[PDB]
Design an enzyme around this catalytic site. Sequence first.
Site, mmCIF file in Angstrom:
data_model
loop_
_atom_site.group_PDB
_atom_site.id
_atom_site.type_symbol
_atom_site.label_atom_id
_atom_site.label_comp_id
_atom_site.label_asym_id
_atom_site.label_seq_id
_atom_site.Cartn_x
_atom_site.Cartn_y
_atom_site.Cartn_z
ATOM 1 N N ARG A 1 -4.489 0.606 -3.212
ATOM 2 C CA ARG A 1 -4.841 2.024 -3.192
ATOM 3 C C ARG A 1 -4.812 2.695 -4.559
ATOM 4 O O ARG A 1 -5.229 3.851 -4.663
ATOM 5 C CB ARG A 1 -3.934 2.781 -2.238
ATOM 6 C CG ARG A 1 -4.322 2.598 -0.790
ATOM 7 C CD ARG A 1 -3.364 3.382 0.093
ATOM 8 N NE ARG A 1 -2.086 2.667 0.252
ATOM 9 C CZ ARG A 1 -1.000 3.227 0.776
ATOM 10 N NH1 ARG A 1 -1.029 4.499 1.153
ATOM 11 N NH2 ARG A 1 0.121 2.523 0.921
ATOM 12 N N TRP B 1 -12.446 -5.670 -3.598
ATOM 13 C CA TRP B 1 -12.393 -7.022 -4.124
ATOM 14 C C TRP B 1 -11.102 -7.678 -3.631
ATOM 15 O O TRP B 1 -10.183 -7.003 -3.160
ATOM 16 C CB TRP B 1 -12.486 -7.047 -5.654
ATOM 17 C CG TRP B 1 -11.503 -6.177 -6.365
ATOM 18 C CD1 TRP B 1 -10.186 -6.474 -6.653
ATOM 19 C CD2 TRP B 1 -11.752 -4.887 -6.923
ATOM 20 N NE1 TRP B 1 -9.612 -5.434 -7.342
ATOM 21 C CE2 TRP B 1 -10.551 -4.446 -7.516
ATOM 22 C CE3 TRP B 1 -12.879 -4.050 -6.971
ATOM 23 C CZ2 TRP B 1 -10.449 -3.212 -8.152
ATOM 24 C CZ3 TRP B 1 -12.773 -2.823 -7.601
ATOM 25 C CH2 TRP B 1 -11.572 -2.418 -8.192
ATOM 26 N N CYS C 1 -2.470 -0.772 2.818
ATOM 27 C CA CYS C 1 -3.366 -1.232 1.756
ATOM 28 C C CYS C 1 -2.653 -1.222 0.410
ATOM 29 O O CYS C 1 -2.230 -0.163 -0.074
ATOM 30 C CB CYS C 1 -4.629 -0.367 1.669
ATOM 31 S SG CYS C 1 -5.703 -0.883 0.289
ATOM 32 N N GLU D 1 -5.208 -13.454 -0.129
ATOM 33 C CA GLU D 1 -5.949 -13.302 1.118
ATOM 34 C C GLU D 1 -6.733 -14.568 1.433
ATOM 35 O O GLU D 1 -6.766 -15.017 2.586
ATOM 36 C CB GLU D 1 -6.868 -12.087 1.056
ATOM 37 C CG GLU D 1 -6.155 -10.769 0.817
ATOM 38 C CD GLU D 1 -7.125 -9.597 0.707
ATOM 39 O OE1 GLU D 1 -7.620 -9.149 1.758
ATOM 40 O OE2 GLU D 1 -7.383 -9.123 -0.418
HETATM 41 C C1 HEM Z 1 -10.335 -2.605 -4.268
HETATM 42 C C2 HEM Z 1 -9.446 -3.569 -4.033
HETATM 43 C C3 HEM Z 1 -8.640 -3.692 -2.716
HETATM 44 C C4 HEM Z 1 -7.657 -4.574 -2.539
HETATM 45 C C5 HEM Z 1 -7.127 -5.588 -3.587
HETATM 46 C C6 HEM Z 1 -7.149 -4.401 -1.196
HETATM 47 C C7 HEM Z 1 -6.137 -5.126 -0.637
HETATM 48 C C8 HEM Z 1 -5.761 -5.048 0.680
HETATM 49 C C9 HEM Z 1 -4.952 -6.033 1.353
HETATM 50 C C10 HEM Z 1 -4.434 -7.334 0.705
HETATM 51 C C11 HEM Z 1 -4.745 -5.607 2.599
HETATM 52 C C12 HEM Z 1 -3.952 -6.382 3.677
HETATM 53 C C13 HEM Z 1 -4.924 -6.707 4.806
HETATM 54 C C14 HEM Z 1 -4.850 -8.147 5.230
HETATM 55 O O1 HEM Z 1 -3.916 -8.868 4.804
HETATM 56 O O2 HEM Z 1 -5.740 -8.565 6.016
HETATM 57 C C15 HEM Z 1 -5.444 -4.332 2.771
HETATM 58 C C16 HEM Z 1 -5.472 -3.543 3.906
HETATM 59 C C17 HEM Z 1 -6.266 -2.439 4.071
HETATM 60 N N1 HEM Z 1 -7.150 -1.959 3.115
HETATM 61 FE FE1 HEM Z 1 -7.312 -2.398 1.146
HETATM 62 N N2 HEM Z 1 -7.854 -3.392 -0.564
HETATM 63 C C18 HEM Z 1 -8.796 -2.935 -1.474
HETATM 64 C C19 HEM Z 1 -9.732 -1.946 -1.215
HETATM 65 C C20 HEM Z 1 -9.837 -1.180 -0.077
HETATM 66 C C21 HEM Z 1 -10.847 -0.180 0.232
HETATM 67 C C22 HEM Z 1 -12.064 0.195 -0.669
HETATM 68 C C23 HEM Z 1 -10.563 0.332 1.437
HETATM 69 C C24 HEM Z 1 -11.286 1.442 2.235
HETATM 70 C C25 HEM Z 1 -12.040 2.391 1.658
HETATM 71 C C26 HEM Z 1 -9.358 -0.320 1.914
HETATM 72 C C27 HEM Z 1 -8.717 -0.068 3.100
HETATM 73 C C28 HEM Z 1 -7.763 -0.849 3.677
HETATM 74 C C29 HEM Z 1 -7.258 -0.652 5.012
HETATM 75 C C30 HEM Z 1 -7.686 0.475 5.982
HETATM 76 C C31 HEM Z 1 -6.352 -1.595 5.252
HETATM 77 C C32 HEM Z 1 -5.563 -1.715 6.579
HETATM 78 C C33 HEM Z 1 -5.950 -3.021 7.238
HETATM 79 C C34 HEM Z 1 -5.535 -3.139 8.676
HETATM 80 O O3 HEM Z 1 -4.622 -2.398 9.146
HETATM 81 O O4 HEM Z 1 -6.124 -4.030 9.347
HETATM 82 N N3 HEM Z 1 -8.962 -1.227 0.977
HETATM 83 N N4 HEM Z 1 -6.020 -4.014 1.563
HETATM 84 C C1 KND Z 2 -11.620 -3.559 1.615
HETATM 85 C C2 KND Z 2 -10.793 -4.830 1.578
HETATM 86 C C3 KND Z 2 -10.215 -5.275 0.393
HETATM 87 C C4 KND Z 2 -9.445 -6.452 0.406
HETATM 88 N N1 KND Z 2 -8.876 -6.919 -0.726
HETATM 89 N N2 KND Z 2 -9.293 -7.147 1.549
HETATM 90 C C5 KND Z 2 -9.853 -6.737 2.711
HETATM 91 C C6 KND Z 2 -9.681 -7.555 3.979
HETATM 92 C C7 KND Z 2 -8.282 -7.464 4.574
HETATM 93 C C8 KND Z 2 -8.395 -6.776 5.918
HETATM 94 C C9 KND Z 2 -8.381 -7.488 7.122
HETATM 95 C C10 KND Z 2 -8.505 -6.813 8.340
HETATM 96 C C11 KND Z 2 -8.482 -7.566 9.656
HETATM 97 C C12 KND Z 2 -7.385 -7.007 10.559
HETATM 98 C C13 KND Z 2 -6.758 -8.062 11.476
HETATM 99 C C14 KND Z 2 -7.779 -8.607 12.468
HETATM 100 O O1 KND Z 2 -7.130 -9.553 13.321
HETATM 101 C C15 KND Z 2 -6.589 -10.663 12.604
HETATM 102 C C16 KND Z 2 -5.574 -10.152 11.592
HETATM 103 N N3 KND Z 2 -6.219 -9.186 10.696
HETATM 104 C C17 KND Z 2 -5.199 -8.692 9.771
HETATM 105 C C18 KND Z 2 -8.646 -5.430 8.340
HETATM 106 C C19 KND Z 2 -8.668 -4.729 7.137
HETATM 107 F F1 KND Z 2 -8.816 -3.389 7.144
HETATM 108 C C20 KND Z 2 -8.536 -5.401 5.930
HETATM 109 F F2 KND Z 2 -8.558 -4.726 4.762
HETATM 110 C C21 KND Z 2 -10.616 -5.574 2.735
#
Ligand code: HEM
Ligand code: KND
Lengths: 411, 411
Positions: free
Chosen positions: B111, B280, B108, B285
């Site tokens: 963070r 947000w 993430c 994305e």
């Molecule tokens: C507040 C603004 C936030 C932004 C800009 C952000 C941005 C991102 C982005 C760009 C990813 C890559 C995931 C993807 O490409 O699909 C990600 C992953 C992730 N985010 Fe954040 N996030 C935010 C908030 C949060 C919050 C509030 C949580 C949980 C409390 C969180 C938990 C996670 C987790 C667990 C992943 C791992 C995703 C996975 O392995 O599938 N994020 N985040």
């Molecule tokens: C809280 C939040 C903030 C932000 N800016 N964006 C997101 C969505 C991105 C996001 C996407 C996903 C999907 C995970 C796998 C599913 O299979 C297809 C590929 N995909 C990666 C999980 C997340 F945990 C996550 F975070 C969430």
Amino acid sequence: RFLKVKNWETDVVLTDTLHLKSTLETGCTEHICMGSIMLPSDVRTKDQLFPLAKEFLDQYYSSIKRFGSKAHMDRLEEVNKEIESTSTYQLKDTELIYGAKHAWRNASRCVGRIQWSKLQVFDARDCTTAHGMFNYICNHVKYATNKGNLRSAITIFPQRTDGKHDFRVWNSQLIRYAGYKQPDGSTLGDPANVQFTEICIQQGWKAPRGRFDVLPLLLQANGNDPELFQIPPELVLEVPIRHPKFDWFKDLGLKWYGLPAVSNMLLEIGGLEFSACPFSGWYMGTEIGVRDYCDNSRYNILEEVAKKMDLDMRKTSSLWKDQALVEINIAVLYSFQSDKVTIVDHHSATESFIKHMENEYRCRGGCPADWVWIVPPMSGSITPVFHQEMLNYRLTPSFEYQPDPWNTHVW
Amino acid sequence: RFLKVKNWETDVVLTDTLHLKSTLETGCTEHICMGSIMLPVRTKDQLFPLAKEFLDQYYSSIKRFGSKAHMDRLEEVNKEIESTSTYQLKDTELIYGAKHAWRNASRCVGRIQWSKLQVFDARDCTTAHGMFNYICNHVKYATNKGNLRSAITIFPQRTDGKHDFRVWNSQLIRYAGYKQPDGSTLGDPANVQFTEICIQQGWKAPRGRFDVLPLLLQANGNDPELFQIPPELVLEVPIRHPKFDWFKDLGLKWYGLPAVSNMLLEIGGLEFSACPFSGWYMGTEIGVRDYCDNSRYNILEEVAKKMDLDMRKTSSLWKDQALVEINIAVLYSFQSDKVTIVDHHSATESFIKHMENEYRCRGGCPADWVWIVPPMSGSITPVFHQEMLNYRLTPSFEYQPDPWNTHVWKG
Ligand code: HEM
Ligand SMILES: Cc1cc(N)nc(CCc2cc(CC[C@H]3COCCN3C)cc(F)c2F)c1
Ligand code: HEM
Ligand SMILES: Cc1cc(N)nc(CCc2cc(CC[C@H]3COCCN3C)cc(F)c2F)c1
Ligand SMILES: C[C@H](O)[C@H](O)[C@H]1CNc2nc(N)[nH]c(=O)c2N1
Ligand SMILES: C[C@H](O)[C@H](O)[C@H]1CNc2nc(N)[nH]c(=O)c2N1
Ligand SMILES: [Zn+2]
């Protein structure tokens, strides 16, 4: 233990068994992944060398369908005889060519490996002096450049003996631009080469103190002090950089050289170490346009280009940096393609690599691949490698990093 | 043991000691790196060490380690486990746990904001209708008329694995996808399978290109139930471009609230299988992945057509050009409607600051380079040049299998 890699854009799943043959170590553990570390990582005792030779000879004779043959066992005994006696051994030409091609084939950070089998191997093991090294390198440059129709090549100098008689090319690449610090504080030319551009001057070189000065060669034979040589300018193919739409682009005064030629790595074949093994191919456009031109620590031209495009550089969310980045990389490709110098864009190169991966999985059982290096530095996710899971492991023969010689040279 | 990471653009070196507190495993070994692999029931036996470890960490953070409150809580959790085979977290512990699962999420980039999470305790919920109500309140709170606020809602923890709470949607708000008989897809191709499940469960599909999917919600291990989020709670943004007036005619919009709802939250050995969380968007994305993945809406061609780029050869970089314009459009639309969004330059810069701060105050910041680096313009963001160490800390967010693959239907 028999691992699977998935492409998430196509659902194509390949099964990897080649990794079980892995010999060296990755730097990762079950507790921590070091996949993004740039560089994880004396005379090889008689005990260590013979197993290394055997493993190499085994795969060589396997590849020519003579595993467990007459000539296989004979060569195995002959090399064993030679190690027991001489404490090293010499590769036959055929073994040397195989070892070099397979070092490239095993280079998990190289996107261009679909070409691995076409490498031109120049045996320079009879070389004794830096003038002779200069001669071998000039012939390499001329053969590889080929008037713009670039051809892959490696020149292999004599192998390490006691670590005291090392052959080394001190340049990181055969062709690079000089870099100097300014009296005020800015940097003229290529900032990445400031330390080397000085060790040339601080050893004899007469610099034009320009922005694109081709550095001289600093060549070290048999552990002696390195010597300076100028590559004949008619051998260094350069490309002035213009844009197909912006005529002020020409006025930026940019050029780059056609031949990417890495010269500071160590080639390891069957335990033997080749400390001087310059190799060359052709460029992927982003290497120049994204990294060489736009890295903040390199030529760093983004600001001045965006200004000439008159983009709103006030806020980062206008994506003016991204916009200039694209245009810069259109021009690089346009310039090389116009002057008829081989270049590949990141879309073609990554599509080629997916086809190469599927060839290696099909005919070899896998392909070690470092995603952090294979995905291009721009437009990552619109290239197919971004969605390709990759397994990274170390096979031998291999190219390895080695200390910069000035830190090591008993001067 | 200490570990160093280097920023190759600034030469800043950081030292990681936090990796020593890592328990779970990475998937890598000394002989293979699994860094690019997408995805690499619990008795009293193993539960009390996991609780002790979590409570030691919790009481350390509040400067009460070894206190009577700490020792009393350990004893109380001890007896509750041996008597009831599980235990309940205090509210303070739940809030701490969820914030730290985010703080520990190595993939993430957002963070820097981890300490400002709004935690909604939904552990008194018992039905799917009750889940719908809590999720509606989450969406309204998180959206805040466009001034987005981070939030997580936490439903009851797993007990025997046969009574799980689950949100069957992968995200709270997502567009339907419909596979046509001619093989083409209407809407979001990523959601075809889930759309079909919803239709089978009784959803009347409007069959447009941007239909917000219903919520499919499962309480206490019962069959899931369909609910429609009130449209007035679903904030959407029409996508227009600040220079290209034809871009609005592409008919694009997106929802403002990214809310992941299929992950599992682990705190102190307890498993929260329904824990939707929201933040947000980073612009890429939507603009890079959602719109321009070949397997998603895939508008590169139609955008590059209306831009009249040279689409015949990839070396014209028409794909990279259209990609930038689409991502400018997404950012412009969200800012113009005053819906919170961050561009990839701002977001990666903030993450580097966060990461350095975490090394100072915490001894480390686990980080997955493969995911942190944005999917466009990689090397002109500062994270590209940052070495990162990936390891697993708890509390954590984990993947879990899709519930339709594991659910035992009641009828
Ligand atoms: C507040 C603004 C936030 C932004 C800009 C952000 C941005 C991102 C982005 C760009 C990813 C890559 C995931 C993807 O490409 O699909 C990600 C992953 C992730 N985010 Fe954040 N996030 C935010 C908030 C949060 C919050 C509030 C949580 C949980 C409390 C969180 C938990 C996670 C987790 C667990 C992943 C791992 C995703 C996975 O392995 O599938 N994020 N985040
Ligand atoms: C809280 C939040 C903030 C932000 N800016 N964006 C997101 C969505 C991105 C996001 C996407 C996903 C999907 C995970 C796998 C599913 O299979 C297809 C590929 N995909 C990666 C999980 C997340 F945990 C996550 F975070 C969430
Ligand atoms: C012929 C076309 C070739 C192309 C398009 C190509 C492309 C690339 C690129 C883009 C990289 C990333 C390096 C960087 O970003 O600095 C790379 C790495 C590498 N290439 Fe290739 N290359 C080619 C030829 C060769 C040849 C002929 C060899 C050896 C015989 C080779 C060996 C390597 C090695 C060892 C690395 C990684 C070295 C390191 O860790 O720094 N390449 N290649
Ligand atoms: C043969 C060939 C074809 C091609 N297209 N490009 C190249 C140059 C890239 C390249 C570069 C390097 C040096 C690595 C260092 C240099 O300092 C900056 C940071 N970097 C980590 C080694 C290689 F082995 C290599 F390949 C070579
Ligand atoms: C194969 C590879 O791991 C996969 O495509 C990953 C790469 N990096 C990513 N990074 C982010 N932020 N999101 C993703 O979905 C992915 N996909
Ligand atoms: C820190 C990180 O490993 C470093 O910036 C890497 C990332 N990926 C790279 N990829 C390529 N092809 N070349 C590079 O120099 C780098 N640098
Ligand atoms: Zn690893």
